[PDB]
């Protein structure tokens, strides 16, 4: 049917090769129309493993991680370490809801093993160092959204939101 | 198009149902698609048709029925061949009206009216400007209904639309259908005001109240004045102007000093008097619309361009739009303050104006901000959503509904944070140092607060009591006696007023100044105050003690000939030579009865030393001592603001609650029974056998596009005739109709469209006029309107009947005429008219039996909360198709200093499903009225009220019907002085229980106990 | 560290015409704030530690020279911690279990979030199970006439508690949390008594987070007012902003000040902190540091019990 | 608190209403319902109860009718109006005492059979006369209302 | 500290009492008593302090300055007050008893509930700290009683059962220990549980319908009929008079407080409703 994938947005270079399909159908959940990014999904209760940044399953509700949603199943060499599920479009913490969904959606999430050997003394990290914000514009918003550099003349507007909208926690271990 | 949009509003002759399928064949005979000819004929002297693409999709994307009766049948009159002109209800589907032999006729009767415009429209000097459009947008209805012509429905197939509403929705959508070709940024603008009741309640003396409710409406009116000529009329979408005592006033003034002729206004002022105003005290003789009838919940539709004089800029300015509305609102407040300053200078020497002349210079930095904040959103549409590269795009029916959902969700997202307008002011510099301007007593402890606003630091302080005369001279206010008179007269000693409440008292002493912002870039900021100086139009305004004394007023009036003898040693039988014009119709129907109704009953027979006088005067002249209690009724509609979105909550209040629209699939079994029944009744003629085929095809055994792939039932038989349709593709009859109905019964609401909104708008306006005439038929006094609600004072005796007559009128079912709104059983019926009523949406009243000397702020805020919380906490048993369920809204709450009683009004959850339902609306109030008659006229002893305490627990504890019947019957018979009376509870009221949880108010649980509580409240209010 | 203030009887914190959610039986000339503004707790502590070394001062420099950083204030039943929650002229008291998952409610679907809001303020709101709003009428009597002394009739709405309730505030420098323990004081209002009882209950004191909860009114300098009241959606998500008077100084018997604030219990966004810090950077900033010193600008993490000031 | 007694009384009255066949017995029962409640609280419970049983004529057949009336619903206690109504009111009092556990039900249904224990029943009631004056007032007044309402005056 | 000394005391209603409040909730009463928060009668500290001040300003007219200082001034609020009463908490109401199965027959007993005892605890706890005369025995009685919360307990032995106020039957679980008499009334003291103690107390309040008669024709005047609610005789309230050391609070307790014992509280003094006796609980236990 119709499926999509979640993809973390870290500050570490675990971002290059995680996607396989760019359009899937004709549309993606994460829309960017003349105002900045929309439909940014947050995963609460789980932290990251930035070195190969993957979702560490915690129970702390203080821990949240953010990422964008696009269509596709990742790289066709996976699904024995990832989160494949199906929720009727009402049980997803999506920020900047612009449109509607058909009350059904198949999602993929990059998941990690807890690494049950250490105490998860986590810590959140913010998006700064526009140099990183610059060279991350290409790797995530070009191979995925071709409309950029054609309809988004306001790159400087969609730059600040990266540094103010997206954030997450990390183990730091 | 701009200044050519009349063909939009006029595309059809309102005798459109009479020329379809030859119902009148002689209309196209003696003349120099079939109906569009006379349409093209009647669009004369100005322009032909704009059918290339100006009106095409606008008519397509306003009717919301092209998707209902098929896109080709919607444009093939000769299908289902309906000679029968049935008028249908918009909200209902079964309420009908028959239309016969009352229609304009060709070339000898069609001219009896078309030139009567040109008796009053043409003669004025004008380069075909939009004032014609501003003098056609309203008086078209008037020249029609004055020509005793019956409003015809829109489509002989689906007649849930009056031709007038059809063409007005056309004109409305025309803005969008035009603008989204050049810049493609048409808009749906929504203006809203924050904390209306919170603001109104900030006053005293009932003058502050009236003018506060008038401010909240004018300051919003002034916003559209800068918008009803800037890009002309027809734009203000939901608050309609079809019956609007503010559009009228503005017009009749706009035909002065703009296009002023004399015989013209003679022709129309009397004409506009009948069908929009009805009040002998017109706009004139007050020079102000007497009723604040702007709700605040207003929305507008926008092209996306701006004209700077003979030249409009097709420029985006995407969001540099709503800030213009905000600066216009601020500029209206600035204009009102400037006018107050000018009027203080013109009144340079007069006490009450020697103060405003003083304060309006003591502080001006503070008053630069409005005393009421508005809340504005703006949703956007682009040509990519109307057309697919040239032509009408799919889902174009869905957008307007989706856009309105977007706007309402923007609003409900802004309700989550309330910003009191006082927060806008800057006070840290003043309140930290010795910087506050205090007149009178400068409080040595920094400052004090207003005794009306309550929160802001007052600027004026009048002493409480030393001798109440000298201290005004001592502390730099009076300095003489000619002015301390007005001082003590307009603001009582011991008062503390902030700047804003001081302005309120000023305006309540000079209402005409509202014109300053009531016209709107139509006069000069000094022209109006000059007209005010050149007159002495005194205005009297009822107080609380005033309205607490209607009956004794009328008994002095009926005893006028034997009372003035015992009178005249206290100057009450005097006559005031001046012509005071109150906005209180009951005063206008009196005060020429040799009685100075312009007095303060608080002073004479509500005082502490003089009442002992008057009671003696009363004890020998057979008049009851006055009642120190008035009533304060306040209505409000259930889910009206959510009826505008199509949700079923107004049809089933309590059954289908609000929150049930997240996972409405849980409540599926009823939403079907509502919508599919509506539809199969929606649309008379032969289409009934058509919508019935597919109604359940959605999931019975047919999947998507699957009833359309199997059912050839009738469409193939409505075709194959002479020349009718030349496109053989018959799947289009159902290929998309199935999707239409699937959306409808999958999303659980009616597909919202501009026609829906303008129809409900005109309905709200008519309901206003009705309720206004109803309050005035009683001896009450209106304080507000707005469709959603109504606030008004009225004596304690005329409450119940009023309420009983209010709801029944609000549901379009009455017994007497309303000036000219000859009410029907579901329609309003102005002289040979039939406009649909609001028969399914409920209504809820709040009543406060308040002693006159009570703190108006508190009584108004309590009347507000006792309706808001009460609206969402009360529940009661309602018979859902026989079996009982629990309802939420549609009650009437009474309050007599704590003593409370909630009275339901429907007890039948789909409010109306039969012409006989109207009889049982608010019937419990008729029960109470009958019982009051039997108790007062002495057929049932008073002790029946108190003797209920013993039958309370028995009747409450009996779950059997006839047993409670016998119980209540002998409770009635025991205290039944005649002993063979037939006063009998309606036999359904046994068992109706009311649960009120999660709040500490004490409410009886059973209906029969609430009835006696209501009776006790009403009686004890009259003593 | 943490201070408990149990009211020994109904008690009133005067409020100017601010609370109208409650269906009042009769009127009353003065309502009572549900949670005492931090000016009141500040002054209540300052009353105990008052000497003649005071001298001149805008009632706060002299006040700040007596105490540590008071943090906030919230309710405390037996075990439970109730917290203020407001959505615009509509107050509520709820426990932590329902704060933890608000952001989703504040950003979810239309009708889902309407459901959530409704059941928050009506169903799970434990206010009316704690606070009863009893009204008291008072009069005076001239010993001569032995009747009511004319013009002397005041009506006040008190705050009556149905069960043992404390007020929880956190402070520092237990060098004063000794001279304060077990001391009954005239906690703000017309001569009402509450008992102080300090314990040792360590809590977090700094956290970064998307959404915060204002346990105490956040003060607006009014130089930001103009450029703040236009974009509330950037800063506040749910609550109420309006002018409040700080209080009434006992030093020189005057109303203290007035400035727009975000009332106790209000969901603000993390865009608040940068705004306030990067709006006032001068004598204003020192003034507002004096303010926050007595528990004014306070947030609380919606996830776990952790506080933070704004300008520090 | 005695706010369930407005339902208990309803049940007992429904029973004794469907139990009396001759309408004259119903009107006589109404008379008793009005008369006895004053005496119970003026003259004491024990004197009024002695009066009631003395006018009730506790014979084993009418006693069996009452026993079934406790459990059945069609039970027909018959005889004479002025004598079956007193038994009906005694049934009212006993229905109360059973359903409020003031006296144990099995003990009652047993002592209404064995003549010897029928006297120990009266003894028990003597040991519960103060308790059965406070509890039963509301119940008996409800029966009074129901009697005046549902049984048409003679 | 600014609260150096406390002073708990009982308020024994010699006659009936009426400390009014405008018609507010009117469970068919037009002039109700002063409710607490739960529904129990209480005396606001405002009324209590005002009446006590008014009384002392006559029976000690020379010391008008000391009364002024300790209890606030009339027109000179240059200085606050140095004494302060807490809201008088209802402590024990009388109630008519028909005691089944008991030795020493009684016609009336006192009645309290665990709610009232908790409210009294709150006071005694919050006071013992500064109170150099720690009422450890009294507070120990009150927190021993509170151990049995949830049972209709009696502070005596020989009740075992009773019918209170001729409508409510209670099985009085006794005290498994011996407790000295809280007051010097040989009458027992029942501590009922709540929701049954609300009835026995709610029914022990004298509600009275009153009328006004036309002086000339021995007939009622129209509208001259209302109801009132009094607190019965022998009722006992509890309160504390706080204080901050002032060197005239010393004399205010040395001369004034230990001297006075009878005071007129509440309204309707002409109907003789309000003579009340003040017993300081520091000389008794
Ligand atoms: Zn004011």
Q: How far apart are CA D143 and CA D6, in angstroms?
A: 9
Give B784's contacts (C-beta < 8 A, 6+ positions apart).
B200, B213, B292, B790, B791, B792
Give the C-alpha separation, B678 to B766, whole Å: 24
Give me the residue label for tokens 């309107």.
Answer: B785
Pairwise CA distance, residues B950 & B944, whole Å: 11
Phi-psi region of E215 (alpha: psi -120 to 50; beta: other; left: phi over 0): alpha
Q: How far apart are CA E130 and CA E108, in angstroms?
A: 37
Q: At what angle do helices B263-272 and B245-254 cross, to 10 degrees?
A: 180
Both tokens assigned to C209: 């987070």
The CA distance from D102 to the nearest CA of chain E, in Å, is: 12
- Distance from C-alpha of B271 to C-alpha of B277, rounded to nearest angstrom: 9
| CA proximity to B488, closest of B512, B464, B513 | B464
Give the CB-side neighbour count of residue C156, counting CA atoms within 13 A: 18
Q: Provide the number of structural domains found in chain D.
A: 1
For chain C, report the end-to-end CA distance as a whole number of angstroms: 18
Distance from Cα B211 to the centre of ligand 1, integer Å: 15
**Residue E117 and residue E189: Cα distance in Å, rounded?**
12
Interchain proximity A93–C103, CB inside 8 Å: yes
B966 closest CB neighbour out of D3, D142, D149: D149
Token pair, residue B54, equals 């100006």
B503/A110 Cα distance (integer angstroms):
64
Query: E-strand spans in chain D?
Result: none
Task: Report domain extents, chain A.
Answer: 1-173
Evaluate whether D148 touches D30 at the Cβ level (below 8 Å): yes
Q: What angle do CA B13, B16, B18 make, to 5 degrees?
A: 130
Partner residue facing D130 (CB), from E100, E168, E199: E100
Report the alpha-carbon distance of residue B905 to residue B654 in Å, rounded.
Answer: 13
Give the whole-angstrom CA distance, residue C45 versus residue C55: 18
How many CA atoms lie less than 13 Å away from B670 in the CB half-sphere?
Answer: 20
Is C47 at the interface with chain E, CB within 8 A?
yes
Instruction: Give Cα separations from C140 to C152, E76, E275 (angstroms).
Output: 6, 15, 20
**How far does the CA of residue E115 sit from the closest CA of chain B (Å)?**
20
Per the CB < 8 A criterion, the answer to whether E245 and E23 are in contact is no
Q: A123 CB contacts (<8 Å, ≥6 apart)?
A: A169, A170, A171, A172
Residue B281 · residue B585 · CB < 8 Å: yes
Structure token digits, residue C50: 């008052």
| Closest listed residue to residue B787, CA positions, set B827, B751, B759 | B759
Q: CA-CA distance, E96 to E106, in Å (whole number)? A: 9
Nearest Cα neighbor of B533 from B269, B368, B361, B350 is: B350
**Residues on E contacting D at a C-beta cutoff of 8 Å:** 98, 100, 163, 166-169, 196, 199
For ligand 1, the distance from its centroid to the CA atom of residue B400, given in whole angstroms, is 43
Nearest to A156 by CA among A130, A122, A123, A129: A130
- Run of H or E residues at B352: helix B351-362
Give the resolution in Å: 3.1
For residues B550 and B793, the answer to whether their CB atoms sit within 8 Å is: no
CA angle B593, B598, B603 (to 5 degrees): 120
Question: What's the helix, strand, coil split of chain C in %, to 5?
Answer: 20, 30, 45
Helix (H/G/I), strand (E/B), else coil: C45: helix
The number of angstroms, rounded, from the C-alpha of C235 to the middle of its chain's C-alpha atoms is 20
A116 CB-contact burial (10 Å; exposed 0-12 / middle 13-18 / buried 19+) = exposed
B479 φ, ψ (degrees, to nearest 5):
60, -5
As a whole number of angstroms, the distance between CA B393 and CA B387 comes to 4
Interface of B with E in 933-972 (CB under 8 A): 949
Using a CB cutoff of 5 Å, list residues around ligand 1, an ion: B 450, 453, 456, 498, 501
For D20, the domain range is 3-150
Mutate to test the interface with B, among E22, E26, E27, E78 (most CBs of B within 10 A): E26
DSSP B920: G
The answer to whether the CB atoms of C304 and A95 lie below 8 A apart is no
CA distance B970 to A32: 74
B603 is in an annotated binding site: no
Report the C-alpha gap between C249 and C255 in whole angstroms: 6
Rounded CA gap, B220 and B199, in Å? 14
Do B957 and D7 form a contact (C-beta atoms < 8 A)?
Answer: yes
Q: CA-CA distances (angstroms) from residue E129 to B276, B359, E1?
A: 77, 57, 12
Which one, of B734, B980, B760, B991, lies nearest residue B876 by Cα?
B991
Interface test with A, best of C103, C237, C269, C274 (most A CBs within 10 A): C103
Tokens linked to B406:
């977007």
C-alpha–C-alpha distance, residues B258 and B254, integer Å: 6
Contact E26/B at CB under 8 A: yes
Yes or no: say if E78 and C224 are a contact pair by the CB < 8 Å rule. no
**Distance (Å, rounded) from C-alpha B478 to C-alpha B351?**
7
Strands C74-76 and C166-170: what pairing?
A: antiparallel
d(CA A39, CA A103): 15
User: Which residue, chain included where needed, has tokens 């022998």?
Assistant: E234
List of residues 6+ apart from B607 with CB closer than 8 A = none
CA of B473 to the centre of ligand 1 (A): 24
Task: Tell me whether strands B439-440 and B460-461 are parallel, antiparallel or unpaired.
Answer: parallel
CA proximity to D46, closest of D128, D104, D102: D128
Q: How many CB atoms lie within 10 A of CB B85?
A: 21
- Which tokens go with E149? 């919360």
Residue B454 · residue C276 · CB < 8 Å:
no
- Pairwise CA distance, residues B713 & B931, whole Å: 58
Q: CA-nearest residue of chain E to B949? A: E28
Q: How far is C245 from chain B (nearest CA, A)?
A: 9
Q: Within 13 Å of residue E72, how many CA atoms lie on the same side as its CB?
A: 15
Span between the terminal Cα atoms of chain D, in Å = 34
Q: Is B925 helix (H, G, I), strand (E, B) or coil?
A: helix
Query: Which residue do the tokens 């003894």 mark?
Result: D123
Per DSSP, the residues of E68-133 read: HHHT--SS-TTS--SEEEPPEEEEEEEEEB--SS-SS--SEEEEEEHHHHHHHHHHHHHHHTT-SS
DSSP annotation of E212:
E
How many CB atoms neighbour CB B476 within 10 A?
10
* Geometric angle at alpha carbon D92, from D86 and D94, rounded to 5°: 105
Kindly state the tokens that stand for B213. 């409710």
Considering only residues 81 to 120 of chain D, which have any Cβ-Cβ distance to chain B shorter than 8 Å?
none
d(Cα A73, Cα A4) in Å, to the nearest integer?
Answer: 7
Element (H, E) at C242: strand C236-245
- Tell which residue, D74, D84, D61, D57, has the closest CA to residue D19: D74
- Experiment type: cryo-EM
Provide the residue count of chain A: 173
d(CA B342, CA B516): 11
D144, two tokens: 């009074």
Chain C CB within 8 Å of residue E175 CB: no
Distance separating alpha carbons of residues B893 and B904, to the nearest angstrom: 9
Cβ atoms of C267 and C238 within 8 Å: the answer is: yes
Strand ranges (DSSP E) for C63-128?
Answer: 74-76, 82-86, 91-95
**CA–CA distance, B194 with B375 (Å, rounded to integer):** 6
Between CA E229 and CA E231 the distance in angstroms is 7
Rounded Cα distance, C289 and C274, in Å: 15
Sequence-distant (≥ 6) Cβ neighbours of residue B468 within 8 angstroms = B488, B493
For tokens 């102005």, the residue is B830
Whether E216 and E135 have beta carbons less than 8 Å apart is answered as no
Q: Which residues pair with E113 in a beta bridge?
A: E192
Beta-carbon contacts of residue B676 (< 8 Å; ≥ 6 apart): B695, B696, B745
Can you tell me which residue has the tokens 């209206």? Answer: B332
Neighbours of B929 (CB within 10 A): 14
Ligand 1 mean position, distance from CA B458 (Å): 6
Counting every residue written for chain B, the total comes to 1023
**Token pair listed for C156:** 């006040």
Mapped to the 3 state alphabet, what secondary structure does B511-552 carry? Answer: HHHHHHHHCCCCCCCCHHHHHHHCCCCCCCCCCHHHHCCHHH
Per the listing, tokens 């070009």 go with A142
Q: How far is the CA of C242 from the centre of ligand 1 (A)?
A: 15
Q: Contact, C275 vs C235, CB < 8 A?
A: yes
DSSP string, B126-176: -SS-TTTGGGTTTHHHHHHHTTT----BS-SSS--SBHHHHHHHHHHHHHH
Strands E189-192 and E153-154, bridge-based pairing = antiparallel
B453 is in an annotated binding site: yes
What's the CA gap between E285 and E282, in Å, rounded?
6
Considering only CA atoms, which of B827, B763, B838, B756 is closest in space to residue B68? B756
Beta bridge partners of B874: B996
Please report how many Cα atoms fall inside a 13 Å half-sphere around the Cα of residue C86, on the Cβ side.
30
- Cα–Cα distances (Å) from C296 to C83, C208, C258, E94, in that order, read 16, 19, 14, 50
Task: Count the Cβ atoms, other than its own, within 10 Å of residue B194.
Answer: 18
Q: D touches which chains (3+ CB pairs under 8 A)?
A: B, E
Instruction: Using a CB–CB cutoff of 8 Å, tell me whether C206 touches chain A.
Output: no
> Ligand 1 centre and the CA of B614: distance in Å?
37
- Other C-beta atoms lying within 10 Å of the C-beta of residue D42: 9
Q: Is the dihedral of CA E261, E266, E269, E273 positive or negative?
A: negative
User: Across the interface, which of C104, C301, C303 has its CB nearest the CB of A93?
Assistant: C104
Contact partners, residue B271, CB within 8 Å, separation at least 6: B139, B142, B143, B146
Minimal C-alpha gap between B1001 and chain E (Å): 10
Tokens representing B510? Answer: 């000079």
The residues, any chain, with a CB within 8 Å of residue C268's CB and separated by 6 or more, are C211, C212, C213, C214, C218, C235, C236, C237, C239, C262, C299
| Contact residues on chain C for E3, CB-CB shorter than 8 A | 183-185
Q: What distance in Å separates the CA atoms of residue A78 and residue B213, rounded to the nearest whole number?
A: 66
Rg (CA), chain E: 20
Beta strands of B455-505 (E only): which ranges? 460-461, 496-497
C51: DSSP letter:
-
> How far away, in angstroms, is B420 Cα from ligand 1 center?
13
Local structure of residue C115 (DSSP, 8 states): H
Breaks in chain B (C–N beyond 2.5 Å) sit after: 32
CA-based nearest residue to B154, from B237, B62, B92:
B62
């Amino acid at each position: 049917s119709t499926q999509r994938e979640y993809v973390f947005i870290p500050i570490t270079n675990s971002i290059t090769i995680d996607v396989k399909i760019t359009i899937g159908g004709s549309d993606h959940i994460t829309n960017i129309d003349e105002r900045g990014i929309h439909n940014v999904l947050v995963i609460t209760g789980y932290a990251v493993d930035e070195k190969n940044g993957r979702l560490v399953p915690t129970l702390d509700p203080c821990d949240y991680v953010k990422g964008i949603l696009v269509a596709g199943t990742p790289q066709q060499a996976q699904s024995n370490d990832f989160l494949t599920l199906k929720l009727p479009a009402n049980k997803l913490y999506l920020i900047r809801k612009k449109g509607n969904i058909s009350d059904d959606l198949k999602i993929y999430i990059p998941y990690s093993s807890p690494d049950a050997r250490n105490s998860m003394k986590t810590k959140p990290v913010s998006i700064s160092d526009d140099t990183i914000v610059n060279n991350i514009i290409k790797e995530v918003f070009d191979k995925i959204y071709n409309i950029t550099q054609k309809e988004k003349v306001k790159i400087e507007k969609v730059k600040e939101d990266i540094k103010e909208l997206f954030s997450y926690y990390a183990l730091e271990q | 198009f701009l200044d050519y949009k009349i063909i939009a509003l006029l595309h059809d002759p309102p005798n459109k149902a009479w020329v379809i399928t030859g119902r009148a064949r002689n209309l196209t005979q003696q003349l120099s698609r079939k109906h569009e000819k006379v349409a093209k004929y009647i669009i004369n002297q100005l322009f032909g048709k704009n059918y290339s693409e100006k009106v095409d999709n606008a008519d397509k994307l306003a009717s919301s029925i092209d998707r209902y009766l098929g896109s080709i049948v919607y444009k093939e009159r000769s299908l289902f061949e309906n000679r029968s002109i049935f008028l249908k209800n918009i909200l209902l589907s079964n309420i009908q009206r028959d239309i016969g032999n009352l229609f304009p006729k060709d070339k000898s009767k069609l001219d009896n009216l078309i030139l009567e415009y040109k008796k009053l429209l043409n003669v004025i000097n004008k380069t075909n400007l939009i004032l014609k459009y501003q003098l056609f947008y309203l008086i078209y209805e008037l020249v029609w209904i004055d020509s005793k012509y019956e409003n015809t429905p829109s489509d002989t197939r689906n007649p849930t639309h009056t031709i007038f509403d059809h063409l007005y929705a056309t004109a409305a959508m025309m803005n969008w259908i035009l603008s989204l070709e050049k810049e493609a940024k048409g808009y749906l603008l929504g203006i809203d005001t924050i904390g209306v009741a919170d603001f109104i309640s900030k006053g005293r003396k009932t003058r502050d109240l009236w003018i506060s409710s008038y401010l909240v409406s004018a300051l919003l009116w002034y916003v559209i004045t800068w918008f009803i000529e800037e890009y002309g009329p027809d734009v203000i979408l939901f608050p309609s102007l079809r019956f609007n005592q503010f559009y009228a006033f503005y017009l009749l003034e706009k035909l002065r000093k703009e296009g002023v002729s004399e015989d013209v206004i003679d022709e129309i002022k009397e004409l506009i008097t009948k069908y929009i105003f009805n009040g002998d005290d017109l706009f004139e003789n007050l020079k102000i619309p007497p009723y604040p009838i702007i709700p605040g919940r207003i929305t507008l539709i926008l092209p996306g361009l701006i004209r700077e004089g003979e030249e409009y800029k097709k420029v985006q300015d995407d969001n540099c739009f709503i800030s213009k509305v905000k600066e216009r609102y601020n500029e209206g407040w600035r204009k009102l303050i400037e006018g107050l300053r000018c009027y203080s200078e013109r009144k340079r020497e007069d006490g009450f104006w020697n103060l405003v002349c003083r304060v309006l210079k003591l502080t001006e930095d503070l008053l630069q901000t409005t005393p009421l904040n508005i809340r504005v959103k703006q949703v956007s549409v682009t040509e990519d959503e109307i057309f697919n590269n040239n032509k009408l795009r799919s889902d174009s029916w869905k957008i307007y509904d989706n856009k309105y959902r977007q706007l309402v969700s923007e609003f409900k997202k802004s309700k989550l944070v309330k910003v009191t307008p006082e927060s806008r002011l800057k006070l840290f510099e003043l309140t930290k140092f010795d910087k506050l301007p205090q007149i009178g007593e400068k409080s040595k402890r920094g400052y004090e607060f207003c005794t009306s606003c309550g929160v802001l630091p007052a600027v004026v302080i009048m002493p409480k009591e030393d001798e109440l005369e000298k201290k005004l001279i001592d502390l730099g206010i009076a300095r003489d006696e000619k002015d301390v008179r007005s001082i003590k007269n307009m603001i009582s000693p011991g008062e503390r007023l902030c700047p804003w409440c001081l302005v309120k008292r000023a305006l309540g002493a000079e209402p005409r100044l509202m014109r300053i912002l009531l016209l709107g870039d139509l006069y000069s900021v000094e022209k109006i105050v000059n007209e005010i100086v050149s007159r002495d139009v005194k205005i009297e305004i009822p107080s609380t003690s005033d309205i607490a004394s209607i009956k004794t007023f009328e008994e002095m009036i009926e005893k006028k000939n034997e009372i003035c003898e015992d009178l005249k040693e206290e100057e009450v039988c005097e006559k005031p030579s001046e012509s005071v014009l109150s906005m209180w119709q009951w005063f206008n129907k009196n005060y020429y009865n040799g009685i100075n109704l312009t007095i303060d009953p608080e002073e004479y027979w509500f005082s502490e030393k003089r009442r002992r006088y008057y009671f003696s005067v009363f004890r020998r002249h057979r008049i009851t001592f006055p009642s120190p209690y008035y009533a304060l009724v306040r209505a409000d509609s259930d889910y009206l603001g959510d009826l505008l979105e199509g949700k079923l909550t107004p049809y089933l209040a309590g059954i289908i609650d609000s929150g049930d629209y997240a996972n409405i699939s849980e409540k599926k079994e009823e939403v079907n029974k509502l919508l599919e029944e509506y539809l199969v009744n929606a649309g008379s003629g032969s289409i009934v056998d058509y919508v019935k085929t597919v109604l359940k095809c959605i999931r019975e055994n047919l999947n998507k596009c699957s009833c359309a792939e199997k059912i050839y039932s009738n469409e193939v038989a409505k075709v194959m005739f002479r020349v009718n349709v030349e496109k053989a593709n018959v799947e289009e009859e159902v290929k998309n109709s199935l999707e239409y109905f699937e959306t409808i019964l999958n999303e659980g609401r009616i597909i919202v469209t501009p026609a829906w909104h303008v129809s409900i708008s005109s309905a709200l306006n008519r309901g206003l006029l009705v309720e206004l005439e109803l309050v005035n038929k009683h001896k009450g006094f209106v304080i507000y309107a707005g469709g959603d609600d109504l606030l008004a004072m009225l004596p304690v005796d005329e409450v119940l009947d009023f309420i009983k007559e209010s709801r029944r009128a609000f549901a379009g079912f009455g017994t007497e005429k309303l000036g000219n709104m000859c009410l029907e059983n579901g329609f309003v019926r102005i002289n040979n008219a039939y406009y649909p009523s609001l028969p399914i949406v409920g209504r809820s009243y709040s009543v406060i039996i308040a002693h006159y000397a009570d703190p108006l702020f508190f009584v108004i805020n309590d009347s507000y909360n006792l309706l808001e919380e009460g609206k969402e906490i009360i529940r009661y048993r309602v018979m859902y198709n026989g079996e009982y369920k629990d309802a939420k809204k549609d009650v009437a709450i009474f309050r007599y200093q704590g003593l409370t009683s909630v009275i339901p009004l429907s007890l039948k959850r789909p409010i109306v499903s039969s012409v006989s339902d109207f009889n049982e609306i608010a019937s419990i109030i008729d029960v109470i009225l009958e019982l009051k008659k039997r108790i007062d006229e002495g057929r049932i002893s008073v002790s029946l009220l108190y003797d209920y305490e013993k039958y309370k627990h028995l009747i409450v504890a009996s779950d059997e019907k006839y047993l409670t019947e016998f119980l209540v019957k002998d409770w009635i018979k025991r205290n039944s002085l005649r002993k063979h009376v037939e006063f009998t509870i309606d036999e359904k009221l046994y068992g109706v229980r009311l649960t009120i949880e999660n709040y500490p108010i004490k409410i009886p649980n059973d209906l029969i106990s609430n009835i006696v509580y209501t009776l006790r409240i009403i009686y004890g209010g009259e003593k | 560290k943490r201070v408990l203030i149990k009211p020994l009887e109904p008690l009133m914190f005067r409020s100017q015409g601010e609370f109208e959610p409650l269906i009042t039986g009769s009127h009353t000339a003065a309502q009572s704030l549900i949670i005492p503004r931090p000016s009141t707790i500040a002054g209540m502590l300052g009353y105990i530690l008052f000497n003649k070394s005071s001298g001149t001062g805008d009632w706060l420099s002299d006040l700040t020279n007596l105490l540590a950083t008071i943090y906030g204030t919230f309710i405390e039943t037996n075990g439970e911690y109730l917290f203020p929650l407001r959505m615009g002229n509509h107050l509520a008291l709820v426990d932590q279990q329902h704060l933890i998952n608000l952001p989703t409610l504040l950003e979810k679907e239309y009708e889902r979030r309407e459901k959530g809001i409704y059941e928050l303020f009506y169903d799970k709101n434990k206010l009316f199970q704690i606070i009863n709003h009893q009204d008291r009428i008072g009069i005076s009597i001239d010993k001569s006439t032995r009747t009511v002394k004319e013009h002397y009739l005041y009506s006040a709405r008190y705050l009556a508690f149905k069960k043992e309730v404390n007020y929880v505030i956190f402070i520092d420098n237990d060098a004063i949390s000794d001279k304060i323990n077990g001391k009954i004081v005239n906690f703000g209002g017309e001569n009402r008594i509450a008992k102080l009882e300090v314990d040792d209950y360590k809590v977090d004191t700094s956290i970064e987070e998307e959404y915060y909860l204002a346990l105490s009114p956040i003060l607006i300098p009014d130089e930001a007012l103009d450029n703040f009241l236009d974009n509330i959606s950037d800063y506040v998500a749910m609550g109420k902003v309006d002018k409040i008077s700080l209080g009434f100084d006992i030093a020189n018997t005057k109303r203290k000040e007035m400035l727009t604030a975000i009332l106790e219990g209000s969901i603000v966004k993390r865009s608040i902190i940068d705004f306030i810090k990067n709006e006032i950077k001068n004598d204003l900033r020192y003034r507002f540091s004096k303010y926050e010193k007595i528990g004014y600008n306070t947030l609380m993490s919606l996830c776990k019990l952790a506080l933070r000031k704004i300008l520090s | 608190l005695y706010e369930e007694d407005y339902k208990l009384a309803l049940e007992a009255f429904k029973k004794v209403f469907n139990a009396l066949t001759h309408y004259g017995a119903k009107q006589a029962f109404r008379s008793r319902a009005r008369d006895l409640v004053e005496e119970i609280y003026n003259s004491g419970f024990i004197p009024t109860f002695f009066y009631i049983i003395s006018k009730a004529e506790l014979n084993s057949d009418s006693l069996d009718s009452l026993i079934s009336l406790f459990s059945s619903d069609n039970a027909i206690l018959r005889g004479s109006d002025e004598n079956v109504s007193y038994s009906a009111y005694l049934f009212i009092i006993l229905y109360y005492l059973i359903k409020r556990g003031i006296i144990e039900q099995k003990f009652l249904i047993q002592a209404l059979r064995c003549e010897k224990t029928r006297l120990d029943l009266i003894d028990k009631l003597y040991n519960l006369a103060p308790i059965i004056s406070a509890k039963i007032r509301t119940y008996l007044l409800a029966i009074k209302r129901l009697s005046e309402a549902l049984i048409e005056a003679r | 500290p600014y609260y150096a000394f406390a002073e708990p005391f009982f308020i024994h209603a010699i006659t009936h009492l009426h400390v009014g409040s405008g018609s507010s909730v009117e469970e068919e009463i037009a002039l109700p008593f002063q409710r607490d928060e739960l529904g129990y009668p209480t005396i606001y500290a405002s009324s209590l302090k005002g009446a006590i001040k008014s009384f002392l300003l006559k029976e000690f007219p020379d010391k008008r300055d000391v009364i002024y200082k300790v209890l606030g001034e009339d027109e000179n609020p240059e200085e606050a007050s140095l004494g302060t009463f807490l809201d008088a908490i209802l402590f024990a109401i009388p109630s008519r008893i028909i005691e089944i199965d008991s030795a020493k027959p009684y016609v009336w007993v006192y009645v309290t509930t665990y709610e009232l005892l908790k409210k009294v605890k709150l006071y005694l706890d919050s006071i013992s700290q500064l109170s150099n005369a720690s009422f450890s025995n009294l507070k120990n009685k009150i927190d021993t009683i509170l151990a049995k919360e949830g049972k209709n307990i009696t502070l005596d032995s020989d009740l075992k059962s009773a019918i209170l106020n001729e409508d409510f039957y209670v099985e009085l679980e006794a005290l498994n220990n011996k407790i000295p008499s809280i007051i010097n009334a040989g009458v027992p003291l029942l501590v009922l549980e709540d929701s049954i103690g609300r009835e026995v107390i709610n029914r022990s309040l004298i509600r009275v319908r009153r009328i006004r008669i036309d002086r000339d024709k021995k007939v009622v005047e129209t509208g001259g009929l209302w109801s009132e609610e009094y607190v019965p005789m022998k009722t006992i309230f509890f309160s504390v008079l706080l204080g901050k050391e002032s060197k005239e609070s010393a004399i205010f307790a040395s001369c004034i407080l230990r001297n006075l014992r009878y005071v007129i509280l509440g309204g309707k003094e002409t109907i003789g409703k309000g003579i009340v006796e003040l017993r300081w609980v520091k000389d008794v236990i």
